[model samples]
Target chain A: SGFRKMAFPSGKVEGCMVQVTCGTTTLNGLWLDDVVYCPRHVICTSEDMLNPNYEDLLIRKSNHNFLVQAGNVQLRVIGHSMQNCVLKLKVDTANPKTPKYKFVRIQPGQTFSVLACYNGSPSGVYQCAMRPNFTIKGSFLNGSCGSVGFNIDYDCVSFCYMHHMELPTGVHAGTDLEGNFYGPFVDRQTAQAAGTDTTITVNVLAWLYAAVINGDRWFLNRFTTTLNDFNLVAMKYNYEPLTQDHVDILGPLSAQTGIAVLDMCASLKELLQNGMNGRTILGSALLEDEFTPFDVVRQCSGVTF
Target chain B: SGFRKMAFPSGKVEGCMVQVTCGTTTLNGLWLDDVVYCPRHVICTSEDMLNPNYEDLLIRKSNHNFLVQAGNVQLRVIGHSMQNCVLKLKVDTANPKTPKYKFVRIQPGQTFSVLACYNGSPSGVYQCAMRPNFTIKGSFLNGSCGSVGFNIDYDCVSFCYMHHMELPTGVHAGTDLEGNFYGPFVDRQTAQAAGTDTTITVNVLAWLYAAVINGDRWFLNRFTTTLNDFNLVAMKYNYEPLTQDHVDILGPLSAQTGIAVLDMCASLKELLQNGMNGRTILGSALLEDEFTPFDVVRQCSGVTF
Candidate 1:
């Protein structure tokens, strides 16, 4: 609604992420108390052609550890194990080549390949096979903003996303006398248009992200990657019910093209069910599954919501 | 609606799967025309304590191989690599001891513990970490019924799930006059209640299942398990728009509980977008993203649809 209030957090921020051009490189690096780090290089590949079979290496740099940034780009490696893997890192970045000796080296404990990597979170391990073999089998992340930091390769590229559920200091998690929630927004018009208070809307979306982040195997496994590409296509229709004309096109595609569009619809149904369950169960973190973010600016599809 | 014709194929079926009580053990075993094997024993656990160095075993049974049945009970093992691993299978089933000898077998090739396993699919590899330590890292599955056979452990437990898009003998992938698709169900009421004819709806759901089965890592990784739990909960509200009470309860839940309900809602939006993309891209396999099923029975929640 035109009457909706704007609550996008700005720079020098303490919570949420903001997309900015850092040194001409547009990145969604997380802003922590005004410190936003931009990434220039990534340890995209790591092979363990050298380990005599041991778990020595970890996510440790010569100096500090890595932290994930608010971005979609991935830095991956394939090795003996997610923890304890390595590859040749040149102190010199000049010769990027496929050398015969790249895979040939002998030494009991002499490290041939100095490991290279980007910063990321320490919260938990993640799966990011962005490309075919870029299976970083494991990457870390900072969920303070629902997942920000480097090569977190998790969700959303736009930096403006916040840890939607984080209490953010003065925010309200406390309920009213009747157990109704607080209004983070300040307009009856926003409330009237949204049918509920605006703050509640924002809270709802944030928590949904948490539940998904904390989701189990079925929603986080092999096929889960196909779960996001629909966002680009989601732009074609906004809250519109599946239609006959659409079916005319989709039905044949399901048959001839051999794609499981219908099964995905089932998967979507399961997801919606998952997102909305905060209401039915008392143990539910959110009391309501009835959330609509008409005013929230979605990062993907740039739907301009 | 009463005029609808029946097309449920039975007895020595070729394409889709059928559920039968195999020796008092009710299972959705795949019926490949004439045979339906029942599982009585499973290797359930495997560990390699005798690998000097190298690959040896690759799904070769003493006399046969593993074939996934139309079932859900998982049979798993934790080992160095899925293709080459082993565990104790008593030549004589007597003492079930958890002694130190279980992990202390040191013969380089003497085979301390023989292998025991249930049958499963051999077509493609799958991930089934049904438990914390049961991360088989890799398993195999047959895509006959969207998914079926044994602890092939991917999707659905009901015996009759079919490979929806597979053209079984005399079925139709061919379009009629204006490409409206065929009617597997022969009733105008099935058409009227379902809206876009009947066969299209069935084909639509089956195809959707296939797409998900074939989906990449994003849709198949860690959090993907959380994706399905909501279905058991989905029964509370069937295709209902989110409500205020749901939010009133959900808002504080998001804030206080520190869960990301709202973010998950965003994820659902993305999934819906992904599910509905069968119509937008010309390269899309499905022509329609507008598919809906008013009468098809969902296997998960058993929502008697």
Candidate 2:
């Protein structure tokens, strides 16, 4: 029974705060946030071993908007019964086969934050290996180290599975339990935004030219994907080639994102220059009536939430 | 004059201070704790077209974090305006007929986060088009939207630029005033965060591998470019004669920023089983090295605060 002035720094953090789980026996060793090691050997934390929280520490199991996107991990160690406790963090990568670690010794009842090296790039699942805790007889206490799995997430899960519609009904404009929702391009203002003046116009022209020349159906697949994916039944059912005046008024269509649509126009113009018939582009839109945004589900539908 | 002496409604907000400048006539809009936006727009205030406070809205220019990675945009306007104020954003592809409007404007003042549509795919220079502003007027803000040069930012620009070391007589590290400034990556934490593990061992191994496979010269270029352009460099780098172990670490790399690294590992076994030659994978040291941290030199270089 050790006496202390402070209450083991107990409190709640705004976000998920990781807590070390020592069994009935007093966890005697050096403790790093990710790895708790002893003098014995390295202890590996498996997916099956960690709970939702522990597992989440490795990956964002829950969708929290302001969660840590990427950064260094700070590990704190309490040395109790820990004599020569050295903790190391290993990051496994290809080509360069070395790992990174911090070998430090901890004294009993002492705490510190260990700065761990990490990198955040095109998101993916990664493993964090550290030696876990065990007993060591060094007069006081001997500790060990182990490893854990880190789900370094830097990407967006597919959003197709998040939908729930029965086709023919025109996708409903609704919200999910979490208030997260999406709908088809609703207004003309946005359309203007997406189809910058010349971007959409040029592409439409290119597709028409391509469809007329090439026997291939790349454009068909392209338009079909958009129509069916976005549930553009109305637009498809009432498809009509835009009048020259209409095209003039609309300008080149720009993508909603920062990329310009005009560039596409330039590229399509090149294709036309290459002797590709215009119908190759226009023929692609022939199945305008078949497009439906509601046809496909959200990509994240499988997410457990 | 709008009638006053009137009941003036019911409650009153005090301690509010405001300033309005409409073409020069200044007026107080309202006042707030210390200060905040009292009125939405400049009403009776004077406007200083010249020397106009770009910070008038107290809004900062877009942060790098806000830079679009992929997908469509939907700009929704919610500001005070009518017909003459609406516009849309669009991105026209090569075949203008099949343009991809990554963004759309729903209303004024409403910026939508773009969805990355090109994940798990090849990386290259994508042309983008931006349409005119969506205004309150009926006129569609369609035209050649500005262009956006698309390249995966896998390179640690912030970090590399920050830590680049040149021979004393050769290329010296660039600096802000007396010290180095911007780079691909941001800070030490960001660099380490992107790097995996705290294991010095891993870093050493990675360094060794990088030195061996790609000569330091190649690693230097790769490292610099990776720091400058991770998405494009890693995506485009050719790694033939795959090492089983190397493949094991970084799985067949694909539309990065889509799936987690570990999940790739899960499929890596399968990837290898199905003839694992020429498979691009994550967990490559070159990937992590792209964002390696740097040391700062305040006075050593030149410049004063």
- Best-performing candidate as measured by DockQ: 1
**Candidate 2, A1-305: lDDT as tens digits:** 00001000000000111112232111112222333332111121334222223222324222121112112333333222212222222112111211232332321111111111111111111111111111110100011011111110122111110111111211111111121222232211111111111112222333332222223334222111222322232233222223344334223222222222233333333433342332323222121111111110111111100
Residues A96-178, model 1: lDDT tens digits = 22111111211111111000111222111111111111111111111121222111011212221111111221121211111
**Tens digits of per-residue lDDT for model 1 on B1-305?**
00010111111121223232212222223332233322211222123212222123334332123333333432221121121121111121121221111112111111010001112221211111111111111111111222221110111212311121122111211111111222232211111111211112122222233223222213222232132343333333232243333334344324533434434333333444354332322113222212122111111111210
Superposed by TM-score, candidate 1 places the C-alpha of residue A245 at a distance from the truth, in angstroms, of 9.4
Query: Model 1 RMSD to the real structure?
Result: 24.4
Native contacts present in each candidate (fraction): 0.00, 0.00
Q: What are the per-residue Cα lDDT tens digits for candidate 2 across B68-129?
A: 21123211212221111111112121211121122122211111111011111111111111
Once fitted onto the true fold, the runs of candidate 2 whose alpha carbons sit more than 4 angstroms away are A1-14, A24-305, B1-278, B283-290, B293-305
